[PDB]
Amino acid sequence: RIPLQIVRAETELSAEEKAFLNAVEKGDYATVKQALQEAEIYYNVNINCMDPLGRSALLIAIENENLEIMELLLNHSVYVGDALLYAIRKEVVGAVELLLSYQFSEFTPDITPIMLAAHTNNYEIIKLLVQKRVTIPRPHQIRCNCVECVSSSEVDSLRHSRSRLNIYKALASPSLIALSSEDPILTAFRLGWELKELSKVENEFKAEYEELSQQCKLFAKDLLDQARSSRELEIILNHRDDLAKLKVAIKYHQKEFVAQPNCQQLLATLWYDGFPGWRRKHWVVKLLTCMTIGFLFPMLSIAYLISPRSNLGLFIKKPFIKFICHTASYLTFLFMLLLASQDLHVQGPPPTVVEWMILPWVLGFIWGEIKEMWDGGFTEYIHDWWNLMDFAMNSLYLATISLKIVAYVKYNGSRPREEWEMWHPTLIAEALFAISNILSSLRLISLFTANSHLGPLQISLGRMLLDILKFLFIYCLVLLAFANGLNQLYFYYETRAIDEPNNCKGIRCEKQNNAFSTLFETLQSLFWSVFGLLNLYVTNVKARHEFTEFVGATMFGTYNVISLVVLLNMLIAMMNNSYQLIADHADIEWKFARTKLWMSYFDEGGTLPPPFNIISLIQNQHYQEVIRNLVKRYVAAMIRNSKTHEGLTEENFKELKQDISSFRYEVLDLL
Amino acid sequence: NLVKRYVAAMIRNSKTHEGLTEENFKELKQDISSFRYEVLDLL
Amino acid sequence: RIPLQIVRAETELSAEEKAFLNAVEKGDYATVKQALQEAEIYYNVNINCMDPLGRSALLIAIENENLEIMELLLNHSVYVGDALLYAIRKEVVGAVELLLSYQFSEFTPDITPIMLAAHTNNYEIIKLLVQKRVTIPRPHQIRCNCVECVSSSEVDSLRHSRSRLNIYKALASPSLIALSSEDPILTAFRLGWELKELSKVENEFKAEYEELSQQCKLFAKDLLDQARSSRELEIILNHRDDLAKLKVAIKYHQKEFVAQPNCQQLLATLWYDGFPGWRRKHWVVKLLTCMTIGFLFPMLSIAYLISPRSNLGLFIKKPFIKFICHTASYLTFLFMLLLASQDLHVQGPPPTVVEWMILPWVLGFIWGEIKEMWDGGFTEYIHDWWNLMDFAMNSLYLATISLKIVAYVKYNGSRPREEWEMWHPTLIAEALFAISNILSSLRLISLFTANSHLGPLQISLGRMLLDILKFLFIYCLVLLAFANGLNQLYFYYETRAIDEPNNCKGIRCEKQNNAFSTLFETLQSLFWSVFGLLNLYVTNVKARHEFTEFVGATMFGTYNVISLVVLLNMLIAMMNNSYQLIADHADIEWKFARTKLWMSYFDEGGTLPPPFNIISLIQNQHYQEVIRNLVKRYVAAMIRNSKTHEGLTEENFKELKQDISSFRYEVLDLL
Amino acid sequence: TANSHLGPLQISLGRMLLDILKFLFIYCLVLLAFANGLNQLYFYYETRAIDEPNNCKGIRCEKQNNAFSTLFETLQSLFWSVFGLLNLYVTNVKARHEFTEFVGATMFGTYNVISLVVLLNMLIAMMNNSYQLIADHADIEWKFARTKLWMSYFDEGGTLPPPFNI
């Protein structure tokens, strides 16, 4: 048998005292008042005493919203401490007003009434608390190293982190940003960015800072949603302290704000500037118009170069026409690169007619990249992540040009390629040119963003490449390990190239040999084993060492089982799990990326596609009025949605029970 | 006949789904309080 | 502008008449009674009139559960029709009792009060209706062809199907089976089986019959769940009209009833008859005991053959020991089959020592199969779906024996196999023996059911083989189509075997040839193209018909794209979707299959593993008492669970509003 | 385990290796069965190593031979058939026993269909189902494993890395 007792004993209540608390619970005003006036005389019943479940009489009256017993206890001067916070968390405006008019606690000591109101996100109570001059202390920097922060971290790191988290949850309140903020949209933007940075820094408290940042982004989105006219939309988007607030939203990565339908509609009607009725057109006439503009890019470009002030000169300044001209010029560049592959023994030859055409687009690409560098700056250049491969293309083109010039100057004769040197400058130049050709032709992935049916697909690829990168570390570790083992076994039986039937050594021969003789060749062989191009007899030696053969063969088999059966199917399962997490927000992310692509063409800089590129208090007052109407509409909408969602608990049933019982004792008293 | 049956069916299904919010609790609270001030007035 | 009107106009109510219905809605008894006694005199207000929303005064009183206005209207003799059914659907026992004591309708004409009560599944109302002698008409056979059924199908097939569905939904009520049934468990079993058959037949009304069958199975499971002692469990399982009801449940495929924890515990303690403490033992001692019993199967078998009445004779009659002995004998048979592969030029040789051992297990397997046939019967034999491959094994073994005997009798000499005939009886016999070896060795999949970690895996394979079978039709259609096309192109360039370098024709040669010359070889080639074993140069001819080559190559490429890229990934996606639908019920299905495997060993027949197999109203009364206690417990449990689930709608809020308003007009009247 | 972005990935591998181990029993049973059948058919036509063009016997030669002559070599051949490194003409004999050839070839085809088409896609579906059950608690399991790794270094014993500990 197990004895049961109370190992942590407390102070029990007496019979009359339990009767008093029970009368408070059922709401008998006559009995409670009689007990109070009897206690004032006899000092028998403690009015500030506790209950078995953690509450006192004022707490019971507050949770049961019985304002009349609550004010009776206030008039009898019961203990008051933390009951204000209890009324704040209870969301009872009458209790809040009465306690403003005048041990164990389930609240942290930092909990201030404004902060608990900001947690409860109740606009009424937050505004009544803000009516009095009440202050929230400022959080320090994200990476602050001052003496106060290091002392608070050293003394009690749990209370420091809880205090910072408590401050930021107070500040991220949608009601507390709707009031007491000169610019709620910009405040929500900066607060969301800061909460994202604190989510990145504080690893353990990551999810709560993530959800606070998401709450701020949702608040900004709904505030934009409450607009009701195109002027108000453009006052919001064009406020600066054009499209300044939109550029700020793009800078702070507010994809929910950017992907608003009204903002996307305004961006679309700015994008289709020259064509007012592109929204309602057929597929065939859209394709015909696109090809018609795309076949006239040199005419429009030379029109801009000659006279910007004409029906054709400023026609390319429209964003869609500029995008079509850039795409058409780049596609003609790729067509010429395809034509370039269509005497070959000259050492360091002069450039042909096709390369003589290619050279100005190469110079224009380099000039455009360095012009974007010099104009935008550094962080904006490195943030794009396409400029890395753009730099790779420019570097490979420059290397090809330099090697071609070096070969043309240094060599003159016509020697057949069969006896050329292996590190010949012409060979190096042509290899670099082919690599740059591939990089140029995969640069077209960036144009899938502007299409409706390919943009989310590109977003899904960009989100699953991260998991491919995660898997590549494990696969390369396994590859290095098995390459090391197979080298350590097989590098005694290395054979010269002369002993081979056709003077070829390596896995690229007709008869594959020496697949595990050197570390480079072992890495190549175990890489090509994934696609099945490495035959089985590469695990063979001329000597009769059958045990050596069997250990090498089972090493190869273990590598194949780990890679193709385990790791590849692991990669399939990982990307399949990752795709479902992206399919929900793919539309929003695609709309954000397409907005960035659209705003990339709104500038006057970079207008000419290559190779042609080498040849004020009223605004504040109107914005304040629009935001004031927006805040009123948003508070009304979130009040309506609070009165439309579920919201109901057993609090409501015990509230109705309390009202019925208080009335019951009232009419039993009056009758 | 189909429209009469459909209106009856969707009324029944409106009276069979969840449909309830804190509007209903404050409605009952309002009825109880209005009655309360009524009988405090009559008595 | 669109005009709006009432295209289907109805009869509006007058002002006093709307006032009367509004007074009924708010529950003013004084106003309603005054209006009734005024209408009795003046004939100005129609008491049976309709409202804008389809109801009358009695309907409003019934839906608002206001029994006092409802009985007032009953005393004033308002229209009564279908208000009883309205009270049945409303689940108000007072309204039901009062209407029992005494146009447009949203109910079908077949709706009878007992049937609507059975739909509502309210035990109280169903019992009050059953107190009066009330009858439900019998549904006919599933495939009945009588004149009444064919006439009802021809006259109005919608009303016939709705009537049958209405009858079966009435009969499948858990409360209506808990009452008025001599055997609720057997009634639920037969009703679930019949509803499954009607689900199979009625294709359009499939889901509702499926959910009714599932409801009956759940009712039977919960009725078994309400047992509270091992005697009651065994009275339920051992009732017959041993384990007769359990065998009936297995026959009717009640997997939920079979997979009950108490039933599985009783089956386990019958299964581990000889070992009382196998439940609490270590893995190593379990493995040691299993190998110890498995290495002694001939000793236990010969002990049973010599003397069944001993410590060793009846030791094999225990189910676990019998299962271990069968498994050990069959594993030794497979070990001998492995040994059989370890002079070869004799035409029709005598059987060797290993085959002379194999022959009695072959005879024992055939004898056991025909004995199971003769004992169990026909439907039980063909239902197992393992007996098909068992028959295949027996037929191949018999064919091997017959061909070996024919070869031994007909041939005597010793000719080397290089010049044997291609259809030689020895060659045919050895091919059939190898095929039977594979079938014998994959017969071990059936033993994965008895294991804890492999049984659900076998269930998942058995459920995804259906989708593989579904996909195989499409793949074989594509295979036949592309084989036909490639034959029609390539069968002009068929070359003889002599013209080949090594006198070999077909895709099984060193140099693959003639892959699309005949239909059989084209089917083989396009089958082997799936696994990559068919090289690319099989699409080549000796002549210089390059267009012919290109069309053949692009046909091969289109087939590879359809098969490996589209169809194989389709199969992967289909099985991945199918696995998630099986992972939920895999435990229940595995427990059912393991119960079937356990009951297969409970019989005295088939005790000896091969080759050794060729060498009473008190029961009804106790069952009735146990079922009566079970029904009382189940009704109490489902009443408690009805008072524990959500169950609440705006019906409850308008009920409380009606009570408050009726009281309000009452006290305004009394004061 | 000590890394933020690789620890849950290692946990996911450690949880899907159990399902790979579950599948390996069925695959090895099928492998043993088809190896037994192909041995029982093909072990009459075993050829010596001397008769071969380059005195090599087995599936590791230039010309693959005797893939189903012994049980060890049949197990090796039907293992290497999974990755496609076993050519089709290993189901060939010098004699003109075309029925023997056809039965051996359809045995090889049935094994390939069971393994690559059915069983491998079964393994893919099984690990894909198993990964979703682990993705929810991967963070908690990784934090537990990293806590164990951290507490492994809190002791004074085992302070010196090798070879300084001797």
Ligand SMILES: CC(C)CCC[C@@H](C)[C@H]1CC[C@H]2[C@@H]3CC=C4C[C@@H](OC(=O)CCC(=O)O)CC[C@]4(C)[C@H]3CC[C@]12C
């Ligand atoms: C991939 C195969 C078909 C070979 C053809 C290669 C290129 C000639 C293709 C591949 C990608 C194509 C691009 C994919 C998407 C677009 C966006 C498309 O714009 C829209 O979606 C129209 C609506 C809008 O811009 O608002 C204009 C054509 C363009 C650049 C396409 C131009 C032609 C490209 C470069």
Ligand SMILES: CC(C)CCC[C@@H](C)[C@H]1CC[C@H]2[C@@H]3CC=C4C[C@@H](OC(=O)CCC(=O)O)CC[C@]4(C)[C@H]3CC[C@]12C
């Ligand atoms: C697949 C590899 C490892 C080669 C070995 C082949 C056979 C020797 C194996 C494969 C399947 C095995 C069977 C799988 C499952 C079981 C059930 C097992 O019983 C239990 O799970 C114990 C608990 C109980 O029976 O209640 C007894 C052994 C047995 C028949 C195994 C016996 C050994 C078998 C036949």
Ligand SMILES: CC(C)CCC[C@@H](C)[C@H]1CC[C@H]2[C@@H]3CC=C4C[C@@H](OC(=O)CCC(=O)O)CC[C@]4(C)[C@H]3CC[C@]12C
């Ligand atoms: C796989 C490719 C890139 C070849 C390189 C092989 C090794 C040189 C790599 C592969 C795995 C790497 C390890 C992966 C993870 C870590 C944890 C990392 O520690 C952290 O994550 C820092 C934070 C912390 O420890 O709290 C320290 C480096 C280390 C041991 C890495 C060291 C370098 C390793 C051994």
Ligand SMILES: [Ca+2]
């Ligand atoms: Ca750029």
Ligand SMILES: [Ca+2]
């Ligand atoms: Ca059987």
Ligand SMILES: [Zn+2]
């Ligand atoms: Zn600081």
Ligand SMILES: [Zn+2]
């Ligand atoms: Zn009938």
